[PDB]
Ligand SMILES: *[C@@H]1O[C@H](CO)[C@@H](O[C@@H]2O[C@H](CO)[C@@H](O[C@@H]3O[C@H](CO[C@H]4O[C@H](CO[C@H]5O[C@H](CO)[C@@H](O)[C@H](O)[C@@H]5O[C@H]5O[C@H](CO)[C@@H](O)[C@H](O)[C@@H]5O)[C@@H](O)[C@H](O[C@H]5O[C@H](CO)[C@@H](O)[C@H](O)[C@@H]5O)[C@@H]4O)[C@@H](O)[C@H](O[C@H]4O[C@H](CO)[C@@H](O)[C@H](O)[C@@H]4O[C@H]4O[C@H](CO)[C@@H](O)[C@H](O)[C@@H]4O)[C@@H]3O)[C@H](O)[C@H]2NC(C)=O)[C@H](O)[C@H]1NC(C)=O
């Protein structure tokens with residue numbers, strides 16, 4: 274058959290993981306399900322045995338004065354009048370039901386990475402006095418406000434949000450202070466130039482470092498709406514590379530098809546078929562909503578975009594578009610995962626946080642392949658097959674040390690009839706032999722002996 278040979282001596286980027294968000298009250302929609310539906314939604318998103326095993330949760334740091342519409346209410350919704358006055362914290366113990374999703378992800382399912390990102394400062398900290406319709410943080414260069422300089426106040430505010438999570442037994446590991454800073458919208462939005470982002474990082478970094486936080490989160494920037502627009506910000510950010518540790522961008526205004534010039538890991542923190550009519554299918558024709566298409570979008574972001582993480586926009590939500598991976602029927606209390614959920618899971622279940630991408634060779638024309646060395650020494654080989662059933666052999670390069678060689682192997686596939694379903698991995702003297710199904714994403718995992726006799 275086709276032999277795929279993994280070269281552990283040729284390494285690329287680290288994989289931090291895969292995930293999604295329940296921002297803008299999508300967590301509230303989950304919380305309104307019956308207890309059984311709540312558990313099924315959480316299981317399909319986070320279960321490492323029977324769901325997508327998503328390893329990252331991205332939360333919104335609420336900017337709004339109330340929970341009107343789908344707004345995320347701020348921890349400090351009321352202005353103290355002046356930035357000289359202590360901020361007025363009005364904690365609701367909920368954070369728009371994201372705290373509950375976070376507590377389940379961490380304490381029930383073992384998630385260790387929690388990315389909190391503000392779309393806006395509270396309106397009283399901004400040039401336009403509103404968390405929506407753009408505007409800029411008061412006190413930045415070119416944004417001097419009558420009300421005063423709110424830059425330190427915003428840093429104190431973000432630090433306090435992380436502290437409220439910490440006191441609710443969730444560690445925020447990564448912290449963002451803008452989203453789509455090039456875009457004014459009718460919802461939470463805030464305009465920063467790349468130079469303004471650098472200016473604010475110089476204020477936020479020492480604020481975090483001097484804080485009483487148990488774990489100092491890594492600062493991220495800037496959740497631009499595409500690879501091209503985020504890459505355009507890196508020049509101005511380069512003066513503060515010592516003060517942040519994560520580059521973030523979405524896949525809307527351009528695709529993650531090149532490696533950004535930055536020393537930091539790069540995360541693709543939001544993508545979706547936002548406009549597309551709901552489909553649950555894995556493959557119909559390669560349309561924008563199909564699970565097959567999304568398995569390939571992840572492949573492209575990692576292999577071509579040099580991404581260390583991949584987050585779909587929303588996990589579970591109501592509504593009839595492909596903005597989300599898991600459909601909620603609010604009336605019926607039902608939860609239906611799309612094959613986009615299983616696409617991301619077919620990655621996330623087997624490519625665990627800290628995995629190192631490694632070279633794999635031997636792919637025929639209908640196969641696209643990638644390989645990952647997990648921290649535990651298990652080697653996950655991704656095979657995306659556009660053709661018919663394909664007989665594949667999976668092995669390490671002969672130069673591998675004998676104790677890196679597998680003692681066992683398993684395989685799982687997702688396709689039109691399978692959701693991360695185990696398939697036969699016949700194992701002979703270090704070689705896994707697998708029938709990769711037609712139009713599937715198959716992951717073959719080679720397991721060393723480790724401490725087992
Ligand atoms: C695809 O994406 C990849 C990223 O996902 C990308 O990889 C990046 O490649 C660049 C280019 O090669 C690498 O840049 C080098 O980095 C070396 C330092 O690396 C170590 O430190 C990094 C930063 O660590 C901070 O951040 C971490 C996470 O936030 C924390 O865990 C740390 O605690 C630390 O935080 C602290 O510091 C912060 C300030 O930085 C601060 O805010 C914070 O509060 C805190 O105080 C780590 O990320 C990095 O980790 C990697 O490697 C380790 C070890 O293997 C792995 O375990 C990790 O998993 C991870 O992969 C390291 O710990 C620099 O030393 C190096 O500079 C030297 O070489 C250049 C030329 O290339 C010289 O110009 C320069 O002068 C330096 O010279 C010195 O050393 C050389 C040795 O060759 C020597 O010859 C010379 O004489 C001199 O003494 C360079 O900058 C970058 O690290 C990669 N990032 C990552 C994440 O791996 C890749 O390029 C992309 N691919 C493509 C094709 O684009």
Ligand SMILES: O[C@@H]1[C@@H](O)[C@H](O[C@@H]2CO[C@@H](O[C@@H]3CO[C@@H](O[C@@H]4CO[C@@H](O[C@@H]5CO[C@@H](O)[C@H](O)[C@H]5O)[C@H](O)[C@H]4O)[C@H](O)[C@H]3O)[C@H](O)[C@H]2O)OC[C@H]1O
Pocket residue numbers: 297343460498525526527547
């Ligand atoms: O309920 C609310 C949620 O809906 C909400 O979600 C936000 C919805 O809007 C999202 O932003 C959209 C992202 O997609 C963009 O369309 C892109 C635009 O760029 C095009 O590419 C260009 C093509 O032409 C070239 O010359 C040019 O260089 C390219 O850039 C691309 O083809 C389109 O797909 C929309 O314009 C955005 O509106 C946003 O990310 C979501 O967060 O959140 C709030 C909640 O209340």
Ligand SMILES: O[C@@H]1[C@@H](O)[C@H](O[C@@H]2CO[C@@H](O[C@@H]3CO[C@@H](O[C@@H]4CO[C@@H](O)[C@H](O)[C@H]4O)[C@H](O)[C@H]3O)[C@H](O)[C@H]2O)OC[C@H]1O
Pocket residue numbers: 322323324609610611691692693694695
């Ligand atoms: O030998 C046993 C193995 O077979 C078993 O493998 C696991 C079996 O469960 C797998 O997780 C599945 C994933 O699919 C879920 O159901 C889907 C829900 O969405 C629908 O669209 C779709 O049609 C359904 O199939 C299911 O709830 C969940 O359990 C898991 O990935 C396999 O590893 O492990 C135990 C062995 O003893």
